[PDB]
Structure formats: structure tokens, C-alpha cells
Write a protein that binds this ligand. Sequence first.
Ligand SMILES: CCCCCCCCCCCCCCCCC[C@@H](O)O[C@H](CO[C@H](O)CCCCCCCCCCCCCCC)COP(=O)(O)OCC[N+](C)(C)C
Ligand SMILES: CCCCCCCC/C=C\CCCCCCCC(=O)O[C@H](COC(=O)CCCCCCC/C=C/CCCCCCCC)COP(=O)(O)OCCN
Lengths: 69, 83
Amino acid sequence: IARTFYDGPEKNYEKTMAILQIEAEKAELRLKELEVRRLMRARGDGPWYQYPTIDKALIDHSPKTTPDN
Amino acid sequence: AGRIASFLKNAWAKEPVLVASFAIGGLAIILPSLSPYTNYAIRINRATPYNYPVPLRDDGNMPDVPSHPQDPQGPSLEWLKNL
Ligand SMILES: CCCCCCCCCCCCCCCCC[C@@H](O)O[C@H](CO[C@H](O)CCCCCCCCCCCCCCC)COP(=O)(O)OCC[N+](C)(C)C
Ligand SMILES: CCCCCCCC/C=C\CCCCCCCC(=O)O[C@H](COC(=O)CCCCCCC/C=C/CCCCCCCC)COP(=O)(O)OCCN
């Protein structure tokens, strides 16, 4: 029965190790991702949460009938 | 060819006001695109000095900019007087 239907304990042992490594890395990635989102939303210095401002190319830099702009 | 002629004859007989209105509106739409004086109107509009012409600082590299209004360089309104 063991020879025909099953494998040795090493396969399950090392598959468990691989699965555990993947799961732990995903957990730490999720925690880091939440922290990064919080910091970016608080400070606004990252690529995320970049809310639009007025484009400066719309300004007209020509004389304006009056010296004082 | 002959159908439109009969339709125009009927419209002129029954509703001359609408015929005249359509003819005048069509001329108003089409004639400006074929007139050589539209560009003259644009040039006349651009020749009206509403605001002050602010002078440019001389940098020693402005051969086409006048140093005085009566200097030959700059735009000329000779074409406007003879119009
Ligand atoms: C000497 C007398 C006493 C002997 C009694 C022996 C007791 C065993 C008999 C009971 C049958 C066991 C139940 C089957 C469950 C096994 C399912 C699974 O585990 O088997 C797969 C293997 O598949 C097997 O072929 C299972 C087939 C069993 C199908 C049962 C059907 C029997 C129904 C009878 C119908 C008869 C005719 C009907 C007429 C209408 C494993 O997949 P695999 O990943 O590859 O194997 C990994 C191990 N390796 C790497 C070493 C290969
Ligand atoms: C391309 C330029 C277009 C813009 C210019 C037009 C400016 C405004 C003119 C249009 C104003 C609104 C028009 C309203 C249309 C009226 C439709 C209608 O109902 O017509 C019938 C009448 O039928 C007609 O429309 C009359 C004949 C068809 C329309 C008129 C002629 C269409 C164009 C003809 C001239 C084309 C250019 C002139 C060519 C000259 C020869 C080279 C109305 O009569 P009823 O009140 O129902 O009768 C009850 C009482 N008896």
C-alpha cells in the first residue's frame, strides 16, 4: 500500500516548508503594504495619493496692459 | 435636373419668403469662404492697437526690431491707407 499509493515523509515535509515560506512572506508583505499606504496617505511624498493641482503651463507670461501684472 | 427646377418653381409660386430666406442664408454661409477681403478684415483687426506696445530690451541681436517708431523696420500699414 505504501509503495503503490503514497510517498515518503520527505515530500510532505519539504512541501510544508515551501508553503510556510510563501505564506510568511505574504504576511510580511501585507503588513508592509499597509504601513506604506498609511505613510503615503499621511505625507503625500510617494507615487500614491497624488491629487491633482493646477498645471503651470496654463499661465500666460506676457505683458498685461498694466506693468504690475 | 428637371425635378428640382419644378420644385423651385412651385416654392417660388407658393412661399417666396422662404425661398428668399434660404437663398440669403446660403449666400451668407458660402460667400465668406470665397472672398479675398476676409484676410484683409483679419489684418485690419490685428492692426488696432488697443493696449500699449511694451518695448523689448536691446540685447544686440535684434536686427528686425526698430529703435524708433519712424525707423523702417517693423510692421507697416501702407496697405491699409491705399484700401
Ligand atoms: C491479497 C488480498 C488482500 C489485499 C487488499 C488490499 C487493500 C486495497 C484495496 C482497496 C482500494 C483502495 C481505495 C483507493 C484509494 C486510493 C486513491 C489514491 O490514493 O491513489 C492514487 C493512485 O491511483 C490509483 O490507481 C487508485 C485507483 C483505485 C480505483 C478504485 C476502483 C475499484 C472499483 C471496482 C470496479 C470493478 C469492475 C466493475 C464492474 C461493473 C494516488 O495518486 P498518485 O499521486 O499517482 O500516487 C502517489 C504515490 N506514487 C508516487 C508512488 C505513485
Ligand atoms: C444653407 C443656408 C441655410 C440657412 C439660411 C436659412 C435662414 C433661416 C431660414 C429658415 C427658417 C425656418 C424655415 C421653416 C421651414 C418651413 C417648413 C414648412 O412647413 O413648409 C411649409 C410649406 O412648404 C415649404 O416649405 C415651401 C417650399 C419648400 C421650402 C422653401 C424652399 C426651400 C429652399 C428654396 C430656395 C433654395 C435656394 C434658392 C435657389 C435660387 C435659384 C438658383 C409651411 O407651409 P404651411 O404653414 O404648413 O401651409 C399652411 C398654409 N398653406
